[PDB]
Amino acid sequence: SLLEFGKMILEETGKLAIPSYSSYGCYCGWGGKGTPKDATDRCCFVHDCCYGNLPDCNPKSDRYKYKRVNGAIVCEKGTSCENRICECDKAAAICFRQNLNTYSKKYMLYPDFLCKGELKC
Protein backbone atom coordinates (compact mmCIF):
# COMPACT_ATOMS: atom_id res chain seq x y z
CA SER A 1 0.00 0.00 0.00
CA LEU A 2 0.91 3.66 -0.23
CA LEU A 3 2.03 3.61 3.46
CA GLU A 4 4.73 0.96 2.78
CA PHE A 5 5.67 2.57 -0.58
CA GLY A 6 6.09 6.10 0.90
CA LYS A 7 8.17 4.77 3.79
CA MET A 8 10.32 2.68 1.33
CA ILE A 9 10.92 5.99 -0.78
CA LEU A 10 11.80 8.05 2.37
CA GLU A 11 14.21 5.39 3.62
CA GLU A 12 15.91 4.98 0.19
CA THR A 13 16.14 8.60 -1.17
CA GLY A 14 15.82 10.95 1.80
CA LYS A 15 12.82 12.63 0.16
CA LEU A 16 9.21 12.39 1.31
CA ALA A 17 6.98 10.54 -1.25
CA ILE A 18 4.51 13.49 -1.24
CA PRO A 19 5.28 16.18 -2.94
CA SER A 20 8.71 14.98 -4.34
CA TYR A 21 7.37 11.97 -6.35
CA SER A 22 3.47 12.39 -6.48
CA SER A 23 3.47 15.25 -8.95
CA TYR A 24 6.81 14.69 -10.82
CA GLY A 25 7.01 14.52 -14.65
CA CYS A 26 4.48 12.69 -16.75
CA TYR A 27 4.16 9.51 -14.70
CA CYS A 28 4.92 10.05 -11.02
CA GLY A 29 1.45 10.79 -9.78
CA TRP A 30 -1.80 9.31 -11.01
CA GLY A 31 -2.04 7.55 -14.32
CA GLY A 32 0.21 8.77 -16.99
CA LYS A 33 0.48 9.63 -20.64
CA GLY A 34 3.23 10.75 -22.99
CA THR A 35 6.98 10.24 -23.00
CA PRO A 36 8.63 10.09 -19.63
CA LYS A 37 10.67 13.32 -18.93
CA ASP A 38 13.78 11.93 -17.26
CA ALA A 39 15.28 8.80 -15.56
CA THR A 40 13.15 9.44 -12.40
CA ASP A 41 9.94 9.71 -14.54
CA ARG A 42 11.01 6.43 -16.30
CA CYS A 43 11.08 4.76 -12.84
CA CYS A 44 7.39 5.86 -12.39
CA PHE A 45 6.40 4.65 -15.87
CA VAL A 46 7.98 1.18 -15.12
CA HIS A 47 6.27 1.25 -11.66
CA ASP A 48 2.87 2.08 -13.35
CA CYS A 49 3.56 -0.88 -15.78
CA CYS A 50 4.47 -3.21 -12.94
CA TYR A 51 1.09 -2.44 -11.16
CA GLY A 52 -0.55 -2.81 -14.60
CA ASN A 53 0.40 -6.57 -14.62
CA LEU A 54 -1.49 -7.05 -11.36
CA PRO A 55 -5.13 -6.40 -12.34
CA ASP A 56 -6.94 -8.42 -9.68
CA CYS A 57 -4.59 -6.96 -7.08
CA ASN A 58 -5.00 -3.64 -5.26
CA PRO A 59 -1.53 -2.02 -4.78
CA LYS A 60 -2.67 1.21 -3.17
CA SER A 61 -4.57 -0.38 -0.26
CA ASP A 62 -3.29 -3.92 0.28
CA ARG A 63 -0.60 -3.88 2.89
CA TYR A 64 2.59 -6.01 2.75
CA LYS A 65 5.58 -6.35 5.02
CA TYR A 66 9.27 -5.93 4.09
CA LYS A 67 12.47 -5.96 6.26
CA ARG A 68 15.98 -4.42 5.82
CA VAL A 69 18.71 -7.07 5.67
CA ASN A 70 21.57 -4.51 6.15
CA GLY A 71 20.11 -1.94 3.73
CA ALA A 72 18.70 -4.49 1.23
CA ILE A 73 14.85 -4.55 0.87
CA VAL A 74 13.54 -8.07 1.46
CA CYS A 75 9.83 -8.61 0.76
CA GLU A 76 8.15 -10.72 3.44
CA LYS A 77 5.90 -13.68 2.60
CA GLY A 78 2.25 -12.77 2.30
CA THR A 79 -0.55 -13.37 -0.15
CA SER A 80 0.46 -13.74 -3.73
CA CYS A 81 -0.73 -10.16 -4.50
CA GLU A 82 1.27 -8.63 -1.61
CA ASN A 83 4.48 -10.37 -2.75
CA ARG A 84 4.08 -8.97 -6.27
CA ILE A 85 3.16 -5.49 -5.12
CA CYS A 86 6.16 -5.42 -2.83
CA GLU A 87 8.56 -6.28 -5.81
CA CYS A 88 7.08 -3.48 -7.96
CA ASP A 89 7.61 -0.89 -5.17
CA LYS A 90 11.12 -2.12 -4.07
CA ALA A 91 12.17 -1.80 -7.75
CA ALA A 92 10.78 1.77 -7.90
CA ALA A 93 12.58 2.83 -4.61
CA ILE A 94 15.88 1.45 -5.95
CA CYS A 95 15.25 3.10 -9.35
CA PHE A 96 14.59 6.49 -7.56
CA ARG A 97 17.84 6.06 -5.50
CA GLN A 98 19.83 5.16 -8.63
CA ASN A 99 18.74 8.39 -10.35
CA LEU A 100 18.87 10.89 -7.37
CA ASN A 101 21.71 12.70 -9.20
CA THR A 102 19.45 13.76 -12.16
CA TYR A 103 16.31 14.47 -10.08
CA SER A 104 15.10 17.93 -11.26
CA LYS A 105 12.65 20.30 -9.42
CA LYS A 106 11.78 21.79 -12.84
CA TYR A 107 9.54 18.60 -13.21
CA MET A 108 7.58 18.93 -9.92
CA LEU A 109 3.91 20.00 -10.57
CA TYR A 110 4.56 19.53 -14.35
CA PRO A 111 1.69 20.66 -16.61
CA ASP A 112 -0.33 17.83 -18.24
CA PHE A 113 -0.32 19.34 -21.84
CA LEU A 114 3.43 18.83 -22.01
CA CYS A 115 3.08 15.06 -21.64
CA LYS A 116 3.11 14.24 -25.43
CA GLY A 117 3.67 10.96 -27.30
CA GLU A 118 3.05 7.26 -26.97
CA LEU A 119 5.01 4.69 -24.88
CA LYS A 120 3.74 1.08 -24.34
CA CYS A 121 4.70 -1.23 -21.28
Instruction: Say if residue 29 carries a ligand binding annotation.
Output: yes
Domains of the chain and any CATH numbers: 1-121 (1.20.90.10)
Catalytic: 47? yes
- Determine the Cα–Cα distance for residues 84 and 36; give it in Å rounded to an integer: 24
> How determined?
X-ray
Instruction: Say if residue 27 carries a ligand binding annotation.
Output: yes
Instruction: Say if residue 62 carries a ligand binding annotation.
Output: no
Smallest CA-to-CA distance from 82 within 26, 14, 27, 4 is with 4
- Marked catalytic residue, from 38, 56, 89, 112: 89
Catalytic: 62? no
- Determine the Cα–Cα distance for residues 34 and 65; give it in Å rounded to an integer: 33
- What are the residues facing 73 on neighbouring strands? 68
3-state secondary structure 23-46: CECCCECCCCCCCCCCHHHHHHHH
In the DSSP assignment, the letter for residue 81 is H
Report resolution (Å) to 1 decimal.
2.3
